[model samples]
Target: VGEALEYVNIGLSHFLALPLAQRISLIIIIPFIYNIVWQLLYSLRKDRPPLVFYWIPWVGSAVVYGMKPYEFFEECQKKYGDIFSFVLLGRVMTVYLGPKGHEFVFNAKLADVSAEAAYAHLTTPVFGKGVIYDCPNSRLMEQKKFVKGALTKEAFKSYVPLIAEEVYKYFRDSKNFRLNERTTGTIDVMVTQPEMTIFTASRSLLGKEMRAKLDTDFAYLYSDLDKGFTPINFVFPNLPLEHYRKRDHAQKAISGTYMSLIKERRKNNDIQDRDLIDSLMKNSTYKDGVKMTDQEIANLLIGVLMGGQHTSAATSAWILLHLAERPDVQQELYEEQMRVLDGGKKELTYDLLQEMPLLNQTIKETLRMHHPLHSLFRKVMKDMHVPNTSYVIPAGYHVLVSPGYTHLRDEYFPNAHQFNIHRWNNDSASSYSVGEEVDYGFGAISKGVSSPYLPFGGGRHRCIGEHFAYCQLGVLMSIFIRTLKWHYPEGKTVPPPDFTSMVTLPTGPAKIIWEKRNPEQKIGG
Candidate 1:
């Protein structure tokens, strides 16, 4: 009784009159204790994936995971053996590492997992409503089908010259090149590639009139919209922030512009089979007999362009950086172009892209080294049992798959760290998933997800833009390789990837020094 009275008096006195330093210390100490206790309890549970421990609550594992996801994932794989759970910004993410994980997440039954639920918050604000992640799964499929009609071989044949023209124009007009003024310059691939991607994609997909509009302040609108795709924006799509404000304004302005163009074509009765806008206007009716509104078409246009922009931009940047480091590969690529194009007499064509194995292999290798998306996610809508395992990821949790991580595994590709385009020369390392094809509303894709090299992903949600990306990237790189000789500026290697955003991009300004291979050589002349 005497000890209890003394304990209460001492404890109560200290607590009531605590100094600011001690108060702050207690605040941190209390949460630290709670987090540790919670982790211990969670570890004792069964039928659940192992949890990655973190010092902080709510903001768990995000710092490490965001900075370098493959490394963070590797550490977790070492401890938990490929399946582990971690908290990311108050949300629980159950990561299933490798190709099987790709199958588990990407190929999950529609009723069990949802891509829309996972992505809508991040995409809707920037893309606007009633398209892409904002729409139903079936509707998105139909939209993909409408867009797919424009990405055919016949269409791609036309896009090759269109994209090449843009590349030539970019080289001639962009202050970075200005072939009229400079024969040599150090330019950032990060800057050049994104501009090239948008300009070419606009030209080939949107047509001549739309491409003309992009040369003005309209490009900055897309730039503002692009800024909305940050990791922070994923967590908080709408906020009282300047970037968020610009993002919203840009979405409205861009969509309105698209709507106006659609109306103008209709008014002039000029909606022939020209580009994606014409393709969509002709056939965007769903299997359910519902026709998409012009506004929705505009939104879809934005979605399509934005989707290609991020992946293509980041990829082209990596390609240039990687090529800059390997002058031997560059020489081989240049020789392949000359051989394929008949001593630079014939023009680059879509069919020619198929013939240039070395060129295609180089693109494939860059994708293997740096898959544009480091991770893909799906929110569980129902309690889902991991295939062949006792673990059950409950509803309200997210499942993340990393084909990007799988691509880098030494087990799959020997000397995986080295950038070797020759690895794709033989079918041995180019182990594409071989199985039956299944169409999930859009087109027939390989049902199997066992392949480790899935830069375009797989399953019902497989990117419909795969062929177009190859077409766009192939032309852009071919022109760059044919017209210019480039290398890393002194003391700069291929900069490491910056994973601060949703896509995997090179850190800092990814710059390279380049000079015309021949001052007399003309690119699209």
Candidate 2:
């Protein structure tokens, strides 16, 4: 390859001196020949999966895969059965379809696959050093256990009220939710949900100190940090680009701020059980007796918060948009909230929120319709066979796990594209899975992710934020349900998804208009 490039360089000099028409023809022909040679070389391993033909070298199929993953996956599934291979930014991605595929990637023996190698390039730099993908997988398991200590059912009860309080406070302060004399108003939920998510999440998880800090320049730093979770960052962490530079700068400043908070808490001796910080401070210890460093704790906190931030924000936004279009469902949810509140509780609590089945089901169906992540990936560490297949996935390749694929299957979810919250509660709603309980030694139990319904993911790496996100979204959704009756803005419809984001967000004009339910405006009987 080196000699080939050297030969090309020498030929290019003589070719440059040729006539314009001759030079142009040679230029096009040379790359055509090169691509043919490259494809021929790629075809040598006929035992492997068929490679998807791409027009370009090195940067192959990235644009198509990156911009619209579901469309790409669907097209490929038709052309390539349950298994196929594609080149993505110089890497070979072998995707296996259906429940077997989920099991193959999610529950595979830990040694056979490495999530860290596939993800570290993206998460390590953004989350900072010595946590998550930067550390060994065992250490990550321990870190998750420590975080779980703060994420218990008891923790969620307290978080519900704090999250509620933050949502209320944000409505009072932000331009999006201005009201007093006004009985009706317009709100761009695109801005509002992301803002609400950060404030509510910070208040519950990061403590009131961090919440208060958001009033200053700190929110700007977080905005900068949010910008860093782009797809480009996942592919190239520090590529001498402006966004990457800002991302690095924001990471340092944000992580430093967290470290200082840790120091101040130690200096003041004011450890309380109000938030994640105190929980970590009081009882975070490894099995072998090595204590966690404060910086590492800070880094892990950022990772945990960020892990949920985008998904949570996107979730609430979509739920509101769908509810805006379906006032009947919104009315049912409002009545559910009213009945729950009429049980003599003035404020929404986690336990109380559980009684609102319709509200919860709406969220469940929303995730089905619009899962935040487009793809889940694992790096193969051992050359392996796709169970019961002739294809052999080589060791140095990436294996794709797609939760999004099954969620929309007409087999698993009839009329899958339509948003119907009751589908979860309906006995007749379609469901499919192996019904085999599976746990990859992750301490927690899942009914097994090798099914059509793993929105929170599965196995050892399944999301720890699932319940917390539910709690947060439930609390906020209840607040909105009780406050007003809303619909999409004039002549506007729910926009198609904007995949440019790190998470799936509805394209803009997510603007909503709300009519305050005064004495005359009761949403339900």
RMSD list, candidates in order: 3.3, 4.4
Report the number of backbone clashes for model 1: 0
Best by lDDT: 1
Model 2, position 19, has a per-residue lDDT of 96
Give lDDT tens digits, candidate 1, residues 150-195.
9999999999999999999999889999876678999988888888
TM-score for candidate 1, residues paired by index: 0.93
Q: For model 1, give the 10-residue run with minimal summed lDDT.
A: 426-435
How would you encode candidate 2's per-residue C-alpha lDDT over 1-525 as one tens digit per residue? 999999899987977889999888987888877987887787777677778888887777888887887888889888877788888887989988778888888887788888999899888878899998998888888888788888988999999989988876775556775444356778888788889999999999999888898899978889888888876666678888778778788888888888788888889998889899998888768778988888888889989999889999999999989888999998898888879899335678888877788888988888888889868888999998877777889899999988887788888899988999888784212233346555433354555566778787777777877778889989998888887789976688777887768788898857888876652432221
What's the lDDT for all of these models? Answer: 0.89, 0.82
| Model 2 worst lDDT run, 10 consecutive residues | 426-435
